[PDB]
Amino acid sequence: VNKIAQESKNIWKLQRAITILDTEKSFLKCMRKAFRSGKLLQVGFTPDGKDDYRWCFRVDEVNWTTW
Amino acid sequence: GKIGVLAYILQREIHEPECRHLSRKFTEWAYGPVHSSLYDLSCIDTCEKNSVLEVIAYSSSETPNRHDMLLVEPLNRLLQ
Amino acid sequence: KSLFVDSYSEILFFVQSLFMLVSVVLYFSQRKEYVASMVFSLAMGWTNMLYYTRGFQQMGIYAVMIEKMILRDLCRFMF
Amino acid sequence: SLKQFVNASYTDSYYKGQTALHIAIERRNMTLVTLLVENGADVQAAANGDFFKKTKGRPGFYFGELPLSLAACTNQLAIVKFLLQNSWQPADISARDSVGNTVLHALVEVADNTVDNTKFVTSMYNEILILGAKLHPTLKLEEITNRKGLTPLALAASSGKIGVLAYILQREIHEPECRHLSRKFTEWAYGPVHSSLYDLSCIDTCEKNSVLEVIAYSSSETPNRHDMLLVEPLNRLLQDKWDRFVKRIFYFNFFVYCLYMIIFTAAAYYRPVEGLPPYKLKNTVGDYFRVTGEILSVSGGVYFFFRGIQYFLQRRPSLKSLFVDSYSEILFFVQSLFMLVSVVLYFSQRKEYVASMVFSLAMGWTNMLYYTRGFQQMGIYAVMIEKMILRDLCRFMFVYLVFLFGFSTAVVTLIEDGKYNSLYSTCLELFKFTIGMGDLEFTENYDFKAVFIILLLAYVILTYILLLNMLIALMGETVNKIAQESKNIWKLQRAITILDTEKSFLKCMRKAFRSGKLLQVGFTPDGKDDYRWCFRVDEVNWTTW
Amino acid sequence: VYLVFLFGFSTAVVTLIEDGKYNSLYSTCLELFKFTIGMGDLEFTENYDFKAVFIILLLAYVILTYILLLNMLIALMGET
Ligand SMILES: CCCCCCCCCCCCC(=O)O[C@@H](COC(=O)CCC)COP(=O)(O)O[C@H]1[C@H](O)[C@@H](O)[C@@H](O)[C@@H](O)[C@@H]1O
Ligand SMILES: CCCCCCCCCCCCC(=O)O[C@@H](COC(=O)CCC)COP(=O)(O)O[C@H]1[C@H](O)[C@@H](O)[C@@H](O)[C@@H](O)[C@@H]1O
Numbered sequence: 001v002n003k004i005a006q007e008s009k010n011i012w013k014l015q016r017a018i019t020i021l022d023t024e025k026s027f028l029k030c031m032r033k034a035f036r037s038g039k040l041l042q043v044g045f046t047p048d049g050k051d052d053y054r055w056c057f058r059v060d061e062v063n064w065t066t067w
Numbered sequence: 068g069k070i071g072v073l074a075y076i077l078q079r080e081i082h083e084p085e086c087r088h089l090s091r092k093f094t095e096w097a098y099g100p101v102h103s104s105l106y107d108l109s110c111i112d113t114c115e116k117n118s119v120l121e122v123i124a125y126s127s128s129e130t131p132n133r134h135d136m137l138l139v140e141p142l143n144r145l146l147q
Numbered sequence: 148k149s150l151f152v153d154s155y156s157e158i159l160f161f162v163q164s165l166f167m168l169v170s171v172v173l174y175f176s177q178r179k180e181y182v183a184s185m186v187f188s189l190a191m192g193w194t195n196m197l198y199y200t201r202g203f204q205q206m207g208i209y210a211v212m213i214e215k216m217i218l219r220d221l222c223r224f225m226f
Numbered sequence: 227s228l229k230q231f232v233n234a235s236y237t238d239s240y241y242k243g244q245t246a247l248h249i250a251i252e253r254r255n256m257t258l259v260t261l262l263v264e265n266g267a268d269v270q271a272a273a274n275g276d277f278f279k280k281t282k283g284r285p286g287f288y289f290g291e292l293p294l295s296l297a298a299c300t301n302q303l304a305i306v307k308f309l310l311q312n313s314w315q316p317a318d319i320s321a322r323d324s325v326g327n328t329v330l331h332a333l334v335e336v337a338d339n340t341v342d343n344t345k346f347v348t349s350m351y352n353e354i355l356i357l358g359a360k361l362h363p364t365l366k367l368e369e370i371t372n373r374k375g376l377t378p379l380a381l382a383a384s385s386g387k388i389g390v391l392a393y394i395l396q397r398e399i400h401e402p403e404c405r406h407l408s409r410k411f412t413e414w415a416y417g418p419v420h421s422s423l424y425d426l427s428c429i430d431t432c433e434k435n436s437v438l439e440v441i442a443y444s445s446s447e448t449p450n451r452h453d454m455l456l457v458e459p460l461n462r463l464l465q466d467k468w469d470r471f472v473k474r475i476f477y478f479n480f481f482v483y484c485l486y487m488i489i490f491t492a493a494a495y496y497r498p499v500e501g502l503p504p505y506k507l508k509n510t511v512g513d514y515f516r517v518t519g520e521i522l523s524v525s526g527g528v529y530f531f532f533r534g535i536q537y538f539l540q541r542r543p544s545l546k547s548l549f550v551d552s553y554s555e556i557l558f559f560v561q562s563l564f565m566l567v568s569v570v571l572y573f574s575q576r577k578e579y580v581a582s583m584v585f586s587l588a589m590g591w592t593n594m595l596y597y598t599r600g601f602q603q604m605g606i607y608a609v610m611i612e613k614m615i616l617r618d619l620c621r622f623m624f625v626y627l628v629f630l631f632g633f634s635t636a637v638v639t640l641i642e643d644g645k646y647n648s649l650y651s652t653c654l655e656l657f658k659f660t661i662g663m664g665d666l667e668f669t670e671n672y673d674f675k676a677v678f679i680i681l682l683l684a685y686v687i688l689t690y691i692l693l694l695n696m697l698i699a700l701m702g703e704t705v706n707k708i709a710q711e712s713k714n715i716w717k718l719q720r721a722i723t724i725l726d727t728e729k730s731f732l733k734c735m736r737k738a739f740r741s742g743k744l745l746q747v748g749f750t751p752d753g754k755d756d757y758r759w760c761f762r763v764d765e766v767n768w769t770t771w
Numbered sequence: 772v773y774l775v776f777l778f779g780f781s782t783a784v785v786t787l788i789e790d791g792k793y794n795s796l797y798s799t800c801l802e803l804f805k806f807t808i809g810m811g812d813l814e815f816t817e818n819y820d821f822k823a824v825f826i827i828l829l830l831a832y833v834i835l836t837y838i839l840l841l842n843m844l845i846a847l848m849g850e851t
């Protein structure tokens with residue numbers, strides 16, 4: 001028990017991930033709302049003149065260095 | 068199970084003209100200490116065949132770092 | 148090989164169902180031995196409740212620790 | 227005209243009030259700030275849109291809504307100085323935002339107890355205090371309260387900003403015309419010895435938000451509530467209060483409760499066995515003692531009942547904090563409830579009062595462990611017992627009770643037309659395995675003996691061999707990780723007892739106010755002399771002669 | 772701590788017991804002590820009413836001393 005703390009947490013998170021994937025793969029209702037994170041414009045300038053929307057996921061961060 | 072390369076790719080940010088589009092992590096806004104990042108999520112959440120989440124989760128148990136790979140930032144936050 | 152060293156929960160739920168179906172077959176075969184099958188399913192049915200300790204972090208990690216104790220320490224001890 | 231142009235600001239409800247000065251400061255552009263101030267920018271424009279509020283469920287950044295507070299909270303000292311002491315439009319250092327937070331309240335709010343953040347927040351706090359002294363010597367910034375009535379110190383204590391609190395309480399400013407801003411002073415120093423003095427204003431006592439009351443009666447969601455009492459003056463001060471005043475009263479309370487529990491035990495032990503209560507009082511010595519004991523027991527029950535209600539009404543826990551914290555109040559209250567229900571059943575002519583009474587009696591004795599606080603080693607031990615119950619016993623009991631019930635149902639299903647043949651009897655019979663009394667052949671009223679023995683061996687291997695030994699292992703892991711946490715929790719418990727005894731005090735005594743009123747500097751900004759009720763701490767240092 | 776718990780539950784049990792063989796602090800104290808050494812009877816008497824109350828008390832004692840306190844003692848010795 002002293003040596004499997006982090007290993008146990010990681011295995012639990014993998015078990016929960018498997019549960020999440022199985023739930024979304026079953027879904028029993030043809031629901032599209034399972035597709036999360038929203039479709040945002042990243043650069044708007046690909047190599048050509050087109051704009052790129054890429055379904056990004058937002059993560060807010062705080063840092064008190066590198067102003 | 069190449070966790071180093073996976074960690075590199077998923078949060079790749081390329082700061083130069085005509086190579087920004089190769090990034091997978093972007094900064095949308097930053098006010099003061101606060102700043103909001105955007106992770107690409109193409110071929111992570113869903114794709115044709117080999118989603119990163121499906122490939123990790125359904126790995127064959129001989130993969131070296133299969134338990135550790137979900138700690139790579141966007142994947143853990145996305146699963147939560 | 149991944150069928151046994153991995154996915155214990157799938158095996159356990161499947162084996163519970165196998166005990167149930169063998170119980171049904173014995174029941175309509177006019178054998179009292181269906182009871183022997185049924186109770187095994189019943190016992191397994193309750194221990195499989197631990198599958199749902201995932202979804203709660205503390206109990207989930209606790210259940211993983213139980214699994215690892217079984218597979219390592221209890222096995223060596225029992226030999 | 228230019229004043230309307232330069233002071234143009236957003237009107238939408240999200241970025242409301244933001245103007246070019248806010249953007250100039252946010253961008254760390256000194257030139258733009260200077261230019262905007264030159265042209266009549268309003269240095270008091272309040273940015274009060276939803277983006278500039280706490281708003282835990284949305285992104286944002288609270289900084290106190292003012293340009294001075296923005297400059298301070300972004301670690302830009304030069305802009306802070308410029309805004310405070312420019313020629314065209316100096317900023318109002320005492321200004322308050324819509325919440326009532328001044329610049330110092332804002333600096334406390336942006337604290338988050340990381341090392342770099344704590345460093346810059348305390349540095350900016352000190353610089354702002356120095357500047358306020360130089361610009362407004364008669365102004366006492368730290369006494370300004372926000373709309374909740376909290377000063378920056380009380381806000382730091384209630385919010386769990388341990389870094390800022392630790393800075394404030396032992397703040398020492400070595401320069402002329404800013405000495406009075408100190409809260410730690412060095413009185414005399416002979417050799418390596420020197421005797422420092424801590425302020426104790428608004429720590430030991432004040433109108434509303436004493437630091438000790440704020441920390442001790444915190445709402446259990448505060449991040450560092452166990453840790454904040456380790457800040458130097460507070461730990462020494464609580465030890466002083468204990469030793470001088472509270473130890474004797476607490477021992478007296480423990481003695482009285484012990485007498486009450488002895489009397490209750492004696493009265494309950496000699497209860498009469500005739501049917502149909504209440505019982506006629508016999509004209510003999512023993513029965514007079516018995517009924518006196520009954521009255522005293524019920525009196526104590528009513529006592530604890532009303533003290534529990536008083537606790538609830540005074541604190542008003544929000545129905546989740548009511549249960550996850552203050553276990554001792556709940557336990558003593560439940561004891562009193564069992565006593566009162568026993569009284570009702572006694573005078574309702576029901577024998578069930580015995581069932582109530584014994585429960586109270588049992589709880590009463592376990593509640594004696596409440597008094598293990600006030601003794602160091604037993605207090606730590608009781609805290610560890612609490613944490614073992616709350617973590618490891620609870621998780622084990624969930625898993626164990628699932629296994630017990632599952633195998634009990636399997637076994638009782640296999641059994642047919644026997645003595646046991648009931649869920650209760652088989653549950654108890656499998657429970658006996660846990661206490662090392664399992665029969666393993668307790669019945670034969672089945673068919674398929676091999677199934678019965680396989681079930682029992684599986685149950686024993688899963689619960690007795692695996693789960694109990696695993697519980698011992700997990701408790702061993704836990705006790706290794708809660709040493710310091712146990713010390714801090716016990717210190718908080720004793721602090722709670724100290725504050726409760728001082729608030730009760732039963733004699734209108736003023737000696738509870740410790741530390742003595744010393745002339746600290748004798749030179750405030752004006753010619754008056756400052757007496758501060760300081761607390762003396764002697765220290766010895768063999769460096770820095 | 773153990774002796775506080777032992778005496779408290781002993782007095783509760785002997786109060787609940789009425790006109791029996793045990794019906795005394797000494798006998799009931801010893802009979803609850805037998806739980807500590809793995810010999811607790813757990814139905815050692817019936818000379819009461821409210822068997823639910825009796826068994827609730829004994830299970831509370833068993834949980835608090837046998838399952839909690841002794842195992843906690845082993846953990847503490849490991850720490851020491
Ligand atoms: C008659 C009565 C018989 C009952 C006997 C059994 C009692 C316990 C029953 C508890 C039921 C819990 C459960 O359902 O199984 C537990 C483990 O149970 C055992 O250890 C049985 C040992 C034999 C976890 O199962 P899981 O599939 O999640 O395993 C993880 C994978 O997910 C993941 O991908 C990784 O590969 C990881 O390495 C895997 O571990
Ligand atoms: C039939 C028989 C039933 C008897 C059941 C009960 C047995 C225990 C008997 C032991 C008596 C000890 C006691 O009287 O209570 C103990 C807690 O016992 C339990 O945990 C019972 C769990 C359920 C201390 O309670 P305390 O008020 O100090 O709580 C702390 C706060 O004060 C502090 O501010 C902090 O917020 C901290 O987080 C809190 O923990």
Ligand SMILES: CCCCCCCCCCCCCCCC(=O)O[C@H](COC(=O)CCCCCC)COP(=O)(O)OCCN
Nearest residue numbers: 773774777792793795796797798799800801802803804805
């Ligand atoms: C870790 C602690 C474990 C506790 C184990 C139980 C012992 C604690 C009992 C203390 C409670 C009060 C004892 C009162 C003594 C008493 O008055 O009981 C006397 C017996 O005297 C003695 O054996 C002295 C016992 C010596 C005490 C050694 C610590 C006779 O009552 P009997 O029912 O036995 O005789 C009835 C015959 N018809």
Ligand SMILES: CCCCCCCCCCCCCCCC(=O)O[C@H](COC(=O)CCCCCC)COP(=O)(O)OCCN
Nearest residue numbers: 627630648649650651653654655657822823824826827830
């Ligand atoms: C740590 C877990 C250990 C488990 C210990 C065993 C108790 C678990 C029992 C749960 C199963 C459900 C019991 C159903 C109650 C019931 O209906 O049975 C009642 C008895 O009720 C009770 O004593 C309540 C017990 C108090 C509940 C304390 C948790 C009377 O049936 P008898 O066989 O005794 O009498 C028949 C004589 N002709």
